[PDB]
Structure 1
């Protein structure tokens, strides 16, 4: 009724390539994750009124907890730093040890999927509200997202693009909600050596 994911991310050279490593610890739909699974990501966003869209493609291998995703901004330059979109842009690919596969809400909701909603509050700055559908549509796992960002400072670390293009490791704590809830705090390195925290509040509902 309470476990975590450990997440590690590599961001590689408007465009971003993301390599993700995720495993669970702390304690029917699984058959779609035996192989390598193609992934499609679509995000439509508005931050302080700045509209943008992101499209991503890649594939995931949940038996080892690895994902590779390539993203492009289809509307030109992003109004926010790519690192701030990483957690929004598929926790079904987390590797669960055999002894706790019964807690894998994300795979067991498949193929029908789940709705994933978050509020992400950047400390001393604005917030994102996100709503996503994560599901299989044929042989492909899709993550379809609407993101609304509000209350950001124009000279802050987000709209001012002061975050380093890298990503730290995090623990994502998960408990049963007939869905799940999760809470965690992301740490973003800032170009002046400070850290920008981003509190994540998440609720997932099966479809």
Structure 2
């Protein structure tokens, strides 16, 4: 069935281990270094003048597949706002995701504000607070401050009757041999599974996505369906 929220508002929730870290920055790639056991990724996404999402995800390898399983809880949305009112354009602007180390948790934090394009020409801000904690006990790479620069295209499968989103994304790190064992799990093309269970103002929904990532070029290609 039709999602109760616009697909662009779920993009950031729906695997930063596929970012391209240039050779001179590979010692700053926390995400891959946490693999295969993975990390817990938590966010609060505050839609300005509207509600918020709170998310928790486990990102880890299961066999040959990188899996991202998320629970999302949305609260305090306006039923006639840009989100529940479906007033956002079907596209996605570039972001710079600013990353800093969180030595106490042996992980990272990240901050950025997404600008969703509204159909009337206005903008809907989605302010992101993020924290990632490794699940395993082994050493991880704790980075110097840097950012991830993103590029995204959203499209449709002309033969898909279900509500869905086709996504192509390129992400490269910027602003600063393998540097970790986990890095080497991403050398080729890696299959991806995404599962999201959501509840926004009591509207329940789920999303399943499948595709592949190529961290050497920072590329994600995925198709998501409402389930």
User: Aligned partners of 2:25 and 2:95: how far apart in 1?
Assistant: 20
The equivalent of 1:206 in structure 2 is 134
Q: Cα RMSD between the aligned structures? A: 0.3
User: Aligned partners of 2:126 and 2:32: how far apart in 1?
Assistant: 26
Deviation (angstroms), 1:124: 0.3
**Residue aligned with 2:35, SS:** coil
- Deviation digits for residues 106-159 of structure 1 (CA, Å, limit 9, x no counterpart): 000000000000000000000000000000011000000000000000000000
The equivalent of 2:68 in structure 1 is 143
Segments of structure 2 that go 5 or more residues without pairing to the other structure are: 136-227
Task: Specify which of 168, 187, 191 is matched with residue 115 of structure 2.
Answer: 187
**Residue aligned with 2:133, SS:** strand
- Deviation digits for residues 12-65 of structure 1 (CA, Å, limit 9, x no counterpart): xxxxxxxxxxxxxxxxxxxxxxxxxxxxxxxxxxxxxxxxxxxxxxxxxxxxxx
User: Aligned partners of 1:106 and 1:172: how far apart in 2?
Assistant: 14
Task: Specify which of 114, 121, 125 is matched with residue 46 of structure 2.
Answer: 121
Taking CA–CA contacts closer than 8 Å with sequence separation of 6 or more, which of the two structures ends up with the larger relative contact order? Answer: 2
Task: Specify which of 116, 125, 134 is matched with residue 59 of structure 2.
Answer: 134
**Residue aligned with 1:119, SS:** strand
User: Aligned partners of 2:32 and 2:82: how far apart in 1?
Assistant: 35
User: Aligned partners of 2:131 and 2:52: how far apart in 1?
Assistant: 16
User: Aligned partners of 1:99 and 1:83: how far apart in 2?
Assistant: 32
Task: Specify which of 78, 91, 100 is matched with residue 153 of structure 1.
Answer: 78
**Residue aligned with 1:84, SS:** helix
- Deviation digits for residues 184-204 of structure 1 (CA, Å, limit 9, x no counterpart): 000000000000000000000
User: Aligned partners of 1:90 and 1:152: how far apart in 2?
Assistant: 26
Number of aligned residue pairs: 132
The equivalent of 1:169 in structure 2 is 94
Structure having the higher strand fraction is 1
Matched, 1:109 2:34: yes
Moved over 3 A (4+): none
Q: TM-score, normalised by structure 2?
A: 0.58
User: Aligned partners of 2:9 and 2:82: how far apart in 1?
Assistant: 10
